[PDB]
């Protein structure tokens, strides 16, 4: 998955998330077209087995011909009272996309962190199934403590939790950030 | 580094510096948000080939400052006509080989977004990337890790090792990647338009490739694929702002639920200034995740399952209030406490 954000000069915006699902998707690449095929069929539920995330059969998400599998993506545009775009944000990486999106919005809109800190700030993730809270390797360990004393058994991600690209309006203009976890940078004028 | 990334006119935030620039340049050439978006995406499909590209699918949340309206473009993959509920019996099965491929929707997404919002010629959007794909670029950090992560499956796979290895060992950060075949394909797409992919000169090769790998995609799948305009995206309120996000099949409802739950605590700078407050804040945050995830398993493609009421519940203030009221400040709970639902 990849997310990107855009604000054009007229103040129109695009939040866009896109994916082939797993790293290198299905691992099928055409030797003729060079097209790498998605394994998006994996995002469906099966009537038989429980998924790798421990989610038991969920008939709302069973495979049907022509049907779109449930996705974790959530490309988002925050719009002001005035009709001015306030924020453009979304995330990418495994199943941590919705929690990461939430976090960046919380970080900026509520904690008041600037757009590059919203994106760089340590993250954490729980999706109920699996039944574990994963924290990033550099989370504030007071967060870790405060959760375990409330009976969360936490684990530490061995890599990182999601990749967030964001653009926030300030009175200074459009403040933009790309996630160092994946190594992008914004551009603009 | 010679930039603080605060722009007075326009910005592109992407996960490869070069693709941010490609989109920035599209805007400077007079292109719309969408034009820049598409151009950056094509580049993203090269620089982060593991993440996304024309073999996959996407959604676009678009805000138009002229009309002051938002819209979503749904262009996620669909199951082939031949697909069925019991087609897989392990996770491995739905993860590798032809059978795990859904019908790509990327290009129809780009097309539909471009017809509605494009201002640059179609071919102009492909130009930088074709250039990039033939030229070659150094492997950036993100993709080097992906390669490392998957070195076993890549190195033992000749068709993947062709572009992704040097001397039959995965490319490492800084080494030059070139995507010759994708440049051809991108060029065909630039000239012949979206049609070439779906019902055109690439179309048989796509079927032949998927099916030779054990898949069941057929030309008819491709001919029938349509991206979808969604005139009224999901929305929630946050303060005096409004967030637009996609409905099912995406996680718009989950994110709406998560945030609607958490807005009730009136978070501020204060919530993290003492570890006591910061502790409880993060606990509540995780609880909101768990409550919203519980309801998620009720979701699916709204064309095939009536999730009207589920979605209305998930994005509603009453429902959110109802779940916040059950969050314990002193403790997390068993899975069942959240009332996960599968009907
Ligand atoms: O939910 C979706 O639309 C894509 C997102 C994958 B991406 O690489 O982040 N697939 C989710 C997923 C992640 N791991 C297994 N399935
Ligand atoms: C798995 O088993 C089902 C049900 O018996 C069958 O229809 C399907 O072809 C099998 N799929 C795979 C991928 O082996
Ligand atoms: C907004 O809508 C107009 C029609 O009113 C359309 O031509 C255009 O695609 C949109 N504007 C932008 C900047 O994308
Ligand atoms: C907000 O909520 C729902 C989306 O389904 C709909 O009733 C309404 O059109 C939405 N409003 C906007 C401005 O999109
Ligand atoms: C929506 O509202 C209430 C939860 O407060 C519940 O009784 C009802 O079953 C919900 N509807 C659906 C479709 O989940
Ligand atoms: C899940 O995790 C929580 C917190 O670690 C724990 O209290 C609970 O017993 C675990 N198991 C289930 C089935 O909920
Ligand atoms: Cl290639």
Method for structure elucidation: X-ray
Contact yes or no for A33 and B205 at CB 8 A: yes
Instruction: State how far the Cα of B179 lies from the Cα of B8, in Å rounded to an integer.
Output: 35
Q: Which of A8, A63, A152 sits opposite B84 (nearest CB)?
A: A63
Q: Which of B127, B106, B164 is nearest to A31 (CA)?
A: B164
The number of CA neighbours under 13 Å toward the Cβ of A36 is 26
Q: Which of B235, B228, B229 is nearest to B311 (CA)?
A: B235
Q: In angstroms, rounded to a whole number, what is the distance separating the alpha carbons of residues B290 and B114? A: 38
Task: Report whether A188 belongs to an annotated binding site.
Answer: no
How long is chain A? 189
* Both structure tokens of B264: 């009730």
Strand partners, A166: A89, A177
What kind and span of H or E run contains A163? strand A163-170
Cα B48 vs. chain centroid, distance in angstroms? 13
What values do phi and psi take at B145, rounded to 5? -70, -45
Note the resolution in Å, 1 decimal. Answer: 2.1
**Which string of DSSP letters, residue by residue, matches A75-119?**
-EEEE-TTS-EEEEEEEESTT-HHHHHHHHHIIIIIS---HHHHH
Which residues in chain A have Cβ-Cβ distances shorter than 8 Å to B50?
20, 23-24
Check residue B14 and report its DSSP letter. Answer: -
Query: Which residues from chain B sit within 8 angstroms of residue A87, using beta carbons?
Result: 241
Rounded alpha-carbon distances, angstroms, from residue B120 to A118, B28, B69: 33, 11, 22
Total CB pairs under 8 A between chain A and B:
552
Q: Report whether A38 contacts B56 (CB < 8 A).
A: yes
Length of chain B: 343
Question: Which ligand is closest to the CA of B51, given by its number?
Answer: 1
Distance separating alpha carbons of residues B30 and B22, to the nearest angstrom: 13
In sequence order, what DSSP letters do the residues of B287-315 get, joined into one string?
Answer: HHHHHHHHHHTT---TTTS--HHHHHHHT
Supply φ then ψ for residue B283, to 5 degrees. Answer: -55, -55
Q: Inspect the interface and report whether the beta carbons of A30 and B181 lie closer than 8 Å.
A: yes
A171 in B contact zone (CB under 8 Å):
no
Domain coordinates in residue numbering, chain A: 1-189
Which residue's C-alpha comes closest to atom 11 of ligand 1?
A95
Nearest residue by C-alpha to atom 1 in ligand 5: B313
Residues near ion ligand 7 (Cβ under 5 Å): A 34; B 163, 179, 181-182
Which phi-psi region, left, alpha or beta, contains residue A8 (left: φ > 0; alpha: ψ -120 to 50)?
beta
What's the rounded Cα separation, in Å, for the pair B137 and B127? Answer: 15
Q: Is A43 annotated as a binding residue?
A: yes
Distance B102 CA to ligand 4 centre (A): 29
Using an 8 Å CB-CB cutoff, list chain A residues near B255. Answer: 74, 76, 98, 101-102
Residue B286, both tokens: 């995780």
- Is the CB–ligand 1 distance for residue A127 below 6 Å? no
Which SS3 state, helix, strand or coil, does residue B79 take?
A: coil
To test ligand 5's pocket by mutation, which of B313, B315, B322 has the most ligand atoms within 8 angstroms of CB? B313
Distance A48 CA to ligand 2 centre (A): 10
Domain limits, chain B: 1-232, 233-343
- B261 in Cβ contact with B292 (< 8 Å): yes
Separation between Cα atoms, residue B185 and residue B179, nearest integer Å: 10
- Token pair in block for residue A47: 């009537």
Q: Which positions in chain B touch A101 (Cβ < 8 Å)? A: 255
Residues B125, B130, B131, B135: what is their CA dihedral angle, to the nearest 10 degrees? Answer: 150
Q: Look up residue A116 and give its two tokens.
A: 């590059």
Q: For A165, which of B13, B97, B243 is closest by C-beta distance?
A: B13
Q: How far apart are CA B259 and CA B236, in angstroms?
A: 9
């Amino acid at each position: 998955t990849a997310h990107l954000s855009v604000v054009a000069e007229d103040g129109s915006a695009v939040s866009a998330t896109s994916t082939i699902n797993l790293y290198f998707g299905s691992k099928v690449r055409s030797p003729v077209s060079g097209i790498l095929f998605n394994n998006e069929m994996d995002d469906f539920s099966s009537p038989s087995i429980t998924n790798e995330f421990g989610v038991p059969p969920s008939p709302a998400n069973f495979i049907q011909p022509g049907k779109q599998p449930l996705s974790s993506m959530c490309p988002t545009i925050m719009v002001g009272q005035d009709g001015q775009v306030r924020m453009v944000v979304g995330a990418a990486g495994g199943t941590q996309i919705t929690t990461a999106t939430a976090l960046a919005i919380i970080y900026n809109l509520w904690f008041g962190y600037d757009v590059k800190r919203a994106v760089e700030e340590p993250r954490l993730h729980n999706q109920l199934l699996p039944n574990v809270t994963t924290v990033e390797r550099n989370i504030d360990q007071a967060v870790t403590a405060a959760l375990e004393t409330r009976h969360h058994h936490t684990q530490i991600a061995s890599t990182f939790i999601a990749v967030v690209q964001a653009i926030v309006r300030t009175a200074g203009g459009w403040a933009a950030a790309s996630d160092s976890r994946k190594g992008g940078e914004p551009a603009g004028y | 580094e010679p930039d603080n990334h605060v722009y007075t006119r326009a910005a592109v935030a992407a996960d490869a510096k070069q693709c941010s620039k490609i989109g920035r340049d599209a805007l400077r050439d007079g292109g719309s948000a969408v034009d820049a978006a598409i151009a950056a995406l094509l580049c993203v499909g090269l620089m982060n080939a593991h993440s996304m590209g024309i073999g996959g699918g996407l959604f676009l949340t678009i805000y138009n400052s002229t009309t002051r309206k938002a819209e979503v473009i749904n262009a996620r993959e669909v199951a082939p006509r031949l697909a069925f509920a019991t087609m897989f019996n392990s996770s491995e099965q739905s993860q590798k080989g032809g059978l795990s491929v859904a019908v790509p929707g990327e290009i129809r997404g780009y097309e539909l977004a471009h017809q509605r919002h494009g201002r640059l010629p179609w071919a102009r959007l492909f130009q930088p990337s074709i250039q990039l794909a033939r030229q070659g670029f150094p492997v950036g950090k993100g993709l080097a890790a992906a390669l490392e992560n998957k070195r076993t499956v890549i190195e033992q796979q000749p068709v993947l090792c062709e572009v992704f290895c040097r001397d039959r060992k995965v490319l490492r950060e800084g080494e030059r990647l070139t995507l010759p075949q994708l440049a051809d394909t991108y060029e065909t797409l630039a000239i012949e338009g979206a049609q070439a992919f779906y019902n055109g000169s690439l179309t048989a090769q796509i079927v032949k490739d998927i099916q030779a790998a054990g898949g069941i995609v057929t030309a008819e799948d491709l001919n029938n694929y349509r991206a979808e305009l969604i005139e009224h995206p999901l929305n929630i309120s946050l303060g005096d702002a409004v967030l637009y996000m996609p409905s099912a099949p995406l996680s718009g409802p989950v994110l709406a639920l998560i945030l609607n739950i958490l807005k009730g605590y009136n978070f501020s700078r204060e919530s993290v200034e003492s570890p006591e407050q910061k502790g409880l804040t993060y606990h509540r945050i995780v609880e909101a995740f768990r409550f919203a995830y519980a309801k998620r398993t009720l979701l699916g493609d709204p064309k095939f399952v009536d999730v009207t009421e589920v979605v209305r519940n998930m994005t509603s203030e009453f429902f959110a209030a109802q779940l916040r009221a059950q969050i314990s400040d002193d403790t997390t709970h068993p899975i069942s406490y959240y009332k996960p639902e599968f009907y």
